[PDB]
Design a protein around this ligand. Structure first.
Ligand SMILES: [K+]
Ligand SMILES: [Mg+2]
Ligand SMILES: [Mg+2]
Lengths: 70, 169, 103, 292, 159
RNA sequence: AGCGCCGUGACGCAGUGGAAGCGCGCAGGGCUCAUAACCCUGAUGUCCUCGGAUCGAAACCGAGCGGCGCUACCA
RNA sequence: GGUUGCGGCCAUAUCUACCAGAAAGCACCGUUUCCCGUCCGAUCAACUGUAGUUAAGCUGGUAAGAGCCUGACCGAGUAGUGUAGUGGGUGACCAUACGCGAAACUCAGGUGCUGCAAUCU
RNA sequence: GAGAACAGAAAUCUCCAGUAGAACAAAAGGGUAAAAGCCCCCUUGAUUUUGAUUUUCAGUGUGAAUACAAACCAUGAAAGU
RNA sequence: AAGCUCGUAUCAGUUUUAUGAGGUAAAGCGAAUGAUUAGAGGUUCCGGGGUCACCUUGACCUAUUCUCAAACUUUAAAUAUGUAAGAAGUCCUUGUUACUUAAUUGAACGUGGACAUUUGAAUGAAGAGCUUUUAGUGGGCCAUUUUUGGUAAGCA
């Protein structure tokens, strides 16, 4: 927070500091991201993650996210 | 399985890619003409590479396509200098197979000067009865996946017919 | 503005000078150069051949320091390629080069 | 392989019959489009289509809702007129063109006039508009994707229709017996092709040559004891019968439409409901991931 | 310098529609135009013959002349302080019938039918269209539909 | 600030959209006791870079780099 | 209901993988004396419809399939925008009043319909 | 992509995939896949007589273009162009 | 300015109904074309410096991920914009023609007959149409909104 406060002085005009309610750089809230790791709907990637959906090839949805359907 | 699903050669293409045009081209044309029993077709260079000493439309190559028992008996002769022995390569994923031999004028036919010596690429194309559906003008279609030619099927037929061997490079 | 111009005639080699306002138009010739292969030179009058076998026995052999050197380099052979400049209904040989490849 | 999603999304599918490879819409536009100052005059097409074992001839005009057939003639009904063999030869093409011509003229009421070419001589001759009378029925040949070639059976149908009475514009360029060096049509050779002479002379030539090939071909002729010399009169009688009675008697049609429906319905695979699809998905989840 | 050619500024309106390129369907060529028909001009970009000028894209006019492959369309064009009669020769690719004039002709037939019935029974059939009238009274029953709603909602960040 | 021109072998420079040349310089042998001169023979180049158009660019186009320049007047 | 000929709208029709196809039709298919066309009867020409096969085409099904189509008070009356004020704000911009109003997103369904003519266990 | 003596990253040949990602003299934009591209066979409609029309517009000229008419032709089996 | 032909209309800087046309605003980039941040997993007969079929700068592919466009775009407003809402109409017979049809088929124009006062939305209409002839003018500037160049300007 204070590092971003120092970065603020380098920009013209007004800037706010906002605490996000999203887990990291994901678009999901923290309780729903917790609900998704307790299930098998989140698989790690480079720095981001991939999500499991009801749509697409079924056998693809088992080869990815293997520990779900258990 | 089904006797209408057996393999057969549908064409064999004899190719000579000469460096230039002129006396060498005309000799190669006479070689291909006599060997095929048909008049061959010449091929012009697509673009000027000029590192091979070629220019556009120069007529640098000569080739001919033969079908039927003609191609059966030329292929029969052409495998002799290979002693009925090809490689695990020389077979394509699409089922077609080919080889090139550096003097076939001297395989079975007469040599004489003013014609010189040459090497020919033999390229065989395999298919099954029903390949008309991808050549005919009306209601042109595509071969079904179970009907396609594959490298393993071509190898199996090439081993059993003409009692040959592969993979022995 | 005005432009003072000094130039050499491409045929007679004479200096010509002229001057004109910078925004009026002057004529520029449609000067073109052509490759020819040097056949016989008999009474002067170099006989030349185009990229085809069609012949130009029409151009006087140069009588200057380039022309005599051309004749000397021609007597022993070593087939030459002569350039002809052909602006405004006049033609003249201006250069000559030894063929590079295909000895 | 493995076409991309963006490829599938941006792909423009051709017209359905172009994908089926059955219609040349470039040729069709010129065949079908009418002079606007002839506002509601239909442009009639003599559609000739050649499949294996059959010949199809149709007089077709166009509407917005689809093409409408004025009259149609098929090769396979020729046994009523006396042709039970060679149902696809050039002579059969002539006979089916004559059948569709006479049938069309009978339907439109143009039989009292416009008899066409009564005596066949193979002479390049259109149907002339009679003096002080209605014009002949005018159709344009529609050969489809057939290649244009001197001696094609589709031009045999064109000849048969024109000699049968319909006015169809054409040239003797593509008829057999047309020499290439000179612009001259041979009526003797064209007559032989019209009356099946080439097949006939093939029969004597092949039989004199050998027996193993001629045994297998022309088995029906041997079965009915038909000589090659006997083709001229039977084709002549076929034309006579066609000109006598083109009335188009259909089949008696045993096993009525409803019975045909009940016969072919009960063996036809039908679409599964969404509930069945869901139950398949659920069971496949249990099968493919239920710890084997 | 400036550029004001015939097809200038027509980059997007002479496009074909997305996934709608290629040949024209035959119903364009099977449509019959008579003199007096009212048509809409919309250029098909794949046919460069008989193409209307960019001005007449979207204009509606009356057919005055019918030729082999084209119609003559009369358009009123505002030039200065008056309308000038403009006569266009357009292939039928760039031309479609005015559907509004199709419902007008159907309404004329319907009006004749209403008057024909009223001439026998039910006089004063009142042909003319009327604008949307104000609503009449009604009784909105509450039984099973008890009103229930809350107030405005507090502000939340949602970021 | 605006505009124009130039860049090629070690050096100075030519150069016709079909792979580059003159003069020296350099190299090998010879002659001389030796070097030079002399004689007989060879070799030396993304043509400033990086892309583009062309079948093919040293040349044409777009940028980038390094030099040379020109205008700079009425107040 | 199936199939064929010609089609209309031109993916709900397309694409990827697999399975199934009574009867008829279509197709593959056999041959080169004839007309015709090729480097090559492979395409096209002609002959037989006979010698054979549904292997392929074709038609349907299967797929938490791709695409495509339709809908939703799903997002969202959000973004945008017309009109109005001696509205607010230093301003960028913003609200309100009288009006119009998306696209992504999410979810849900669907995956050709049909005209004329002939034929069919 | 997979293959074929020399042949290799680039010479010719073959198959599969390939909505155009090519080509269409020349800027750029639009248009086009049994074609408007490529190859082949014919040809001169790049003709005669005028009028009408569109764009720039004064509703003048010039340039360019569109659709007919009356002839004579080209091409094709023909519709047609 | 002079009027002329007529006397409520062949109308309208407007709305409604119906029907078109458009590619801006916005949006989009795990959709095309360009631009662009970061990793992950596979592909070295695609060159990896490494020892006998490898983690170890690359390039390619695939699924993702951050950010964009006056001369990009699937989608796509608001405002503005075309046309129609009838008597010069509609329907029924049967007349003309050298055009058109296979045709006694159409096309266009008609004779005769039928449609009644809501003659086919709303509001208004101050008279409606038409013609001749001639003046001055042909430096503009300001404001809200949209908008280009410019650091900007009481700038252009
Ligand atoms: K625009
Ligand atoms: Mg033109
Ligand atoms: Mg003034």
């Amino acid at each position: 927070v204070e590092g971003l406060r120092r970065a603020r002085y380098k920009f013209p005009g007004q800037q706010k500091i906002i605490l996000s309610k999203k887990w990291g750089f994901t678009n999901l809230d923290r309780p729903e991201y917790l609900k998704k790791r307790e299930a098998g709907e989140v698989k790690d990637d480079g720095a981001f993650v991939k999500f499991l959906s009801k749509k697409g090839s079924l056998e693809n949805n088992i080869r990815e996210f293997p520990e779900y359907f258990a | 399985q089904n006797p209408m699903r057996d393999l057969k050669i549908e064409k064999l293409v004899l190719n000579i890619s000469v460096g230039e045009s002129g006396d060498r081209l005309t000799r190669a044309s006479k070689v291909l003409e006599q060997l095929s029993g048909q008049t061959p077709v010449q091929s012009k260079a697509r673009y000027t590479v000029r590192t091979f000493g070629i220019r556009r439309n120069e007529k640098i190559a000569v080739h001919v396509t033969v079908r039927g028992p003609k191609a059966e008996e030329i292929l029969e002769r052409g495998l002799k200098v290979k002693e009925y022995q090809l490689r695990d390569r020389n077979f394509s994923a699409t089922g077609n197979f080919g080889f090139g031999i550096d003097e076939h004028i001297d395989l079975g036919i007469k040599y004489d000067p003013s014609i010189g010596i040459f090497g020919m690429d033999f390229y065989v194309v395999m298919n099954r009865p029903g390949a008309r559906v991808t050549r005919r003008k009306r209601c042109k279609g595509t071969v079904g996946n179970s009907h396609k030619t594959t490298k393993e099927d071509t190898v199996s037929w090439f081993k059993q017919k003409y009692d040959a061997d592969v993979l022995d490079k | 503005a005005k432009v003072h111009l000094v130039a050499i005639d491409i045929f007679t080699g004479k200096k010509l000078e002229d001057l004109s306002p910078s925004t009026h138009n002057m004529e520029v010739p449609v000067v073109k150069r052509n490759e020819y292969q040097l056949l016989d030179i008999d009474d002067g009058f170099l006989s030349l051949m185009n990229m085809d076998g069609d012949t130009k026995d029409d151009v006087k052999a140069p009588e200057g320091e380039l022309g005599d050197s051309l004749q000397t380099a021609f007597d022993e052979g070593k087939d030459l390629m002569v350039t002809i400049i052909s602006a405004m209904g006049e033609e003249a040989a201006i250069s000559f080069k030894e063929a590079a490849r295909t000895d | 392989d493995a076409k991309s999603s963006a490829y599938s999304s941006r792909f423009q599918t051709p017209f359905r019959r172009r994908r089926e490879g059955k219609t040349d819409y470039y040729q069709r536009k010129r065949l079908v489009t009418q002079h606007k100052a002839k506002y509601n005059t239909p442009k009639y097409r003599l559609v000739v289509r050649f499949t294996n074992k059959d010949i199809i001839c149709q007089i077709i005009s166009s509407t917005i809702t689809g093409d409408v057939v004025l009259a149609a003639a098929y090769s396979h009904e020729l046994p009523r007129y006396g042709i039970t063999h060679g149902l696809t030869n050039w002579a059969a093409a002539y006979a089916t063109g004559l059948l569709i011509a006479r049938r069309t003229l009978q339907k439109l009421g143009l039989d009292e006039t416009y008899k066409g070419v009564e005596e066949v001589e193979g002479e390049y001759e259109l149907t002339e508009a009679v003096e002080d009378g209605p014009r002949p029925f005018k159709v344009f040949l529609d050969i489809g994707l057939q290649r244009t070639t001197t001696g094609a059976r589709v031009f045999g149908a064109l000849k048969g229709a024109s000699d049968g009475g319909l006015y169809v514009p054409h040239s003797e360029n593509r008829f057999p017996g047309w020499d290439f060096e000179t612009e001259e049509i041979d009526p003797e050779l064209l007559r032989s092709y019209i009356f099946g002479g080439h097949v006939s002379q093939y029969m004597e030539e092949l039989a004199d040559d050998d027996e193993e090939r001629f045994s297998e071909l022309f088995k029906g002729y041997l079965a009915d004891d038909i000589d090659a010399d006997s083709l001229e009169d039977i084709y002549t009688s076929a034309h006579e019968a066609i000109r006598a009675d083109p009335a188009f008697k259909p089949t008696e049609k045993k096993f009525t439409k409803e019975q045909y429906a009940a016969e072919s319905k009960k063996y036809r695979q039908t679409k599964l409901s969404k509930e069945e699809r869901a139950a398949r998905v659920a069971a496949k989840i249990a099968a493919l991931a239920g710890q084997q | 310098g400036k550029s004001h050619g015939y097809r200038s500024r027509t980059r997007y309106m002479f496009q074909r529609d997305f996934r709608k390129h290629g040949a024209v369907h035959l119903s364009t060529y099977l449509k019959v135009y008579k003199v007096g028909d009212i048509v809409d001009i919309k250029a098909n970009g794949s046919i460069q013959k008989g193409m209307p000028h960019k001005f007449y894209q979207g204009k509606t006019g009356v057919v005055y002349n019918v030729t082999k492959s084209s119609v003559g369309v009369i358009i009123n064009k505002m030039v200065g302080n008056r309308y000038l009669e403009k006569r266009l020769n357009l292939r039928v690719e760039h031309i479609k019938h005015s559907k509004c004039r199709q419902e007008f002709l159907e309404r004329v037939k319907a009006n004749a039918a209403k008057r024909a019935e009223a001439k026998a029974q039910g006089v004063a059939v009142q042909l003319k269209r009327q604008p949307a009238q104000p609503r009449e009274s009604r009784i909105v029953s509450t039984e099973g539909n008890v009103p229930q709603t809350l107030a405005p909602v507090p502000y939340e960040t949602f970021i």
